[PDB]
Ligand binder design. Structure first.
Ligand SMILES: Cc1noc(C)c1[C@@H]1C[C@@H](c2cc(-c3cncnc3)c(F)cc2F)N[C@@H](N)S1
Length: 359
């Protein structure tokens, strides 16, 4: 997996991308790595923001599915034509698979002006694939067609770099032990948070609130998104812990920027065993992101908890699809100081962990 190390690139707040080839002869494209969606979709028209795009006319192995797909977001939209072609990852496993590809023909607020990627690789499950679950996601196709193990891992380092290890784990990318949390349901990478601590102090909330209406691991989101009831209780604790300096209310809501005082955030995740949990701890260096001007990278959510780049950059994260579990370990590349470091600790005794999940 040595060749897969350092295969991710990107710009701060614009996501992480991997190099991929599509078609015959191979057309090179940079593709956003997204564990929060399930579609493989690439720019296929000369949009002004794009360095390059998928040209189906040049591909002898392209097959038309004669179906369209419309994907609206809360903050964006893309529309495309469905098809299949041969897909390879140059700095991944030495294999070529026939995968579903949505040729993006129309979009709004999807591509980023100034970014170096022109497509999205949805690494989540078929349940949330569009138009429906019959459209097989890329990784499902990869595992079925080859001998690549049903597992991938991500090391996102805080312009930016990282590693996507496809089909395995690179032990040099983390320190200590991996700790696993069960994937509750195979749609998003859904997990269960059982306890939240700010500087070691428990928020004293019903743990069902932490997962309302879900908690997910998402490489395609920058921020740590929390449910509003959890967010206001979390922010109130951060305000009290950072009472040394005063900050405007707009800063905490992400409406304005600010130019040891900040507390650590610990998330206890459901363990592999009954009544067993473990905790992951992040630093200010993770949730206070440079834009010196800093943006408070914790926001309220209506879709539930989203463990975005804020969480993931502190850890080496293993998406063990084969065993329906997600592993966390201290990242060997995470940003810290001499006083505090990111941590993965366990085991802990936590009762009624099944009550924390929303139904
Ligand atoms: C769901 C959803 N509802 O509203 C939004 C904004 C989404 C995202 C959809 C998708 C997505 C992310 C980014 C991005 C941006 N900045 C950094 N990283 C990724 C992008 F540019 C285009 C995208 F299509 N990935 C997701 N996980 S969240």
């Amino acid at each position: 997996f040595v060749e897969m190390v350092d295969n991710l690139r990107g710009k701060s707040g614009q996501g992480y991308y991997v190099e991929m080839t599509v078609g015959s002869p191979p057309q090179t494209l940079n593709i956003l790595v997204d564990t929060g969606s399930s579609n493989f979709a690439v720019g296929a028209a000369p949009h002004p923001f794009l360095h390059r795009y998928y040209q189906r006319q040049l591909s002898s192995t392209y097959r038309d599915l004669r179906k369209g797909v419309y994907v609206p977001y809360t903050q964006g939209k893309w529309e495309g034509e469905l098809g299949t072609d041969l897909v390879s990852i140059p700095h991944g496993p030495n294999v070529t698979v026939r995968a579903n590809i949505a040729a993006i023909t129309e979009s709004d607020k999807f591509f980023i002006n100034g970014s170096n990627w022109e497509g999205i690789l949805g690494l989540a499950y078929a349940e949330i694939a569009r138009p429906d679950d019959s459209l097989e996601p890329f990784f499902d196709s990869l595992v079925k067609q080859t001998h690549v193990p049903n597992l991938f891992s991500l090391q996102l380092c805080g312009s930016v770099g990282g590693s996507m290890i496809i089909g395995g784990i690179d032990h040099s990318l983390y320190t200590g032990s991996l700790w696993y949390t069960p994937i509750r349901r195979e749609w998003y990478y859904e997990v269960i948070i059982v306890r939240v601590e700010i500087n070691g102090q428990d928020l004293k909330m019903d743990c069902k609130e932490y997962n309302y209406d879900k908690s997910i691991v998402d490489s395609g989101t920058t921020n740590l998104r929390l449910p509003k009831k959890v967010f206001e209780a979390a922010v109130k604790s951060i305000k009290a812990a950072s009472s040394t300096e005063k900050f405007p209310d707009g800063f905490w809501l992400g409406e304005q920027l600010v130019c040891n005082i900040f507390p650590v955030i610990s998330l206890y995740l459901m363990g592999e065993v009954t009544n067993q949990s473990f905790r992951i701890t992040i630093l200010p260096q993770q949730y206070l992101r440079p834009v010196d001007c800093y943006k408070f990278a914790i926001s309220q959510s209506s879709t539930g908890t989203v463990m975005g780049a804020v969480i993931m950059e502190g850890f080496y994260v293993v998406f063990d699809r084969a065993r329906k579990r997600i592993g966390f370990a201290v990242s060997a590349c995470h940003v810290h100081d001499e006083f505090r470091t990111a941590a993965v600790e366990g085991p802990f005794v936590t009762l009624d962990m099944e009550d924390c999940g929303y139904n």
